[PDB]
């Protein structure tokens, strides 16, 4: 399952 | 940075003159990812040509296969053309059934 | 440890030809199982491997929004990028990341990964504590002030703690067919001459899965490290993997040359010679 990304 | 693409010509199985078989053109260590690859027969390009997706190595350059089926004989030459923006001119590499 | 799992994001900016193109592609080891792509028609996230198609509706629509939703995190993220490096919007782009779980045989995490590279260039890296960061500039101390901030490390660790690691638990039992079989090369040794004083001796290895291995070349003992040529491992298109190691040898000097083949799905590994 892919994972919640943040803003870099 | 820009890395130049290495380039592999090869059949899926060993070359067998008559038996149906699959041409691949595995281009590797290369970025960015924008980059134009043709497997070509006698200098004409395939069109029934497909590829995996988009992914790249721990080092971060990108890889890309290039494949479709083809039966191979003593007559017929092979080839894959690749052009990146780090390359002048288009390079090609040939079909060699020993490599 | 056994077997891990990774996902490989590709955005790239191309100002003037539409919103920077994202791509995910997720794998179990050296099998990819999943695609998403902001270019797709309509863009899903799709099986790419016989065992994740048995995955519910829940399941396609849960990962669908989260590669939609990274798709525009992605996209603000280029945005940020450009300014912390005072590029022009004329220039394309590309961000990558690699975020995934290792785990034992038994299961259990070895490691934890959530890594970028801006153009190429590592920018910054969720360390083994998945507590903290290691920024390659001052950019990517922009990046770390604000992932500190939010307490982003936090959440990371629970999805490579967590998440991950049940996924691939899940994942290896419904593909332990393929996911936890290994199979060996074949292998053999070619010669080819090039004039009346070298041949070259070229040793074959095809058809293995996983793709580590470690093919090398020793004349009377001696490791042939500086002399060898390797060629990178490369994908046969059956999901299995192919490789060569050659050297040039004297004529008549073939039987003290022995080709060495190491790969898990070999009980002991292989020595090799030219069979004339």
């Given at each position: 399952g892919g994972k919640k990304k943040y803003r870099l | 940075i820009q890395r130049t693409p290495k380039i592999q010509v090869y059949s899926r199985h060993p070359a067998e003159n008559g038996k149906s078989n699959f041409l691949n053109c595995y281009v590797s260590g290369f970025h960015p990812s924008d980059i134009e690859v043709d497997l070509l027969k006698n200098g004409e390009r395939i069109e029934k040509v497909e590829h995996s997706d988009l992914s790249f190595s721990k080092d971060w350059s990108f890889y890309l296969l290039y494949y479709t089926e083809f039966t191979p004989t003593e007559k017929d030459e092979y080839a894959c053309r690749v052009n990146h923006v780090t390359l002048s001119q288009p390079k090609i590499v040939k079909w060699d059934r020993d490599m | 440890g056994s077997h891990s799992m990774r996902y490989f994001d590709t955005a790239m900016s191309r100002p003037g030809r539409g919103e920077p193109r994202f791509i995910s592609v997720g794998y179990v080891d050296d099998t990819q199982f999943v695609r998403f792509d902001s270019d797709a028609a309509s863009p899903r996230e799709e099986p790419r491997a016989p065992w994740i198609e048995q995955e519910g509706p829940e399941y396609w629509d849960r990962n669908t929004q989260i590669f939609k939703t990274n798709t525009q995190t992605d996209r603000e993220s280029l945005r940020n990028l450009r300014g912390y490096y005072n590029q022009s919007e004329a220039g394309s782009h590309t961000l990558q990341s690699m975020y995934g779980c290792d785990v034992g045989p038994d299961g259990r995490l070895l490691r934890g990964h959530n890594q970028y590279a801006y153009d190429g260039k590592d920018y910054i890296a969720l360390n083994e504590d998945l507590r903290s960061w290691t920024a390659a500039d001052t950019a990517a101390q922009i990046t770390q002030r604000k992932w500190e901030a939010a307490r982003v490390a936090e959440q990371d660790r629970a999805y490579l703690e967590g998440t991950c690691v049940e996924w691939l638990r899940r994942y290896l039992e419904n593909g332990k067919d393929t996911l936890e079989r290994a199979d060996p090369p074949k292998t053999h040794v070619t010669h080819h001459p090039i004039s009346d004083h070298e041949a070259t001796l070229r040793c074959w290895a095809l058809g293995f899965y996983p793709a580590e291995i470690t093919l090398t070349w020793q004349r009377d003992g001696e490791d042939q490290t500086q002399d060898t040529e390797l060629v990178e491992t490369r994908?046969?298109?059956?999901r299995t993997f192919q490789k060569w190691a050659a050297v040039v040898v004297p004529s008549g000097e073939e039987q003290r040359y022995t080709c060495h083949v190491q790969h898990e799905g070999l009980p002991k590994p292989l020595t090799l010679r030219w069979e004339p």
């Open positions: - | - | 994908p046969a298109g059956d």
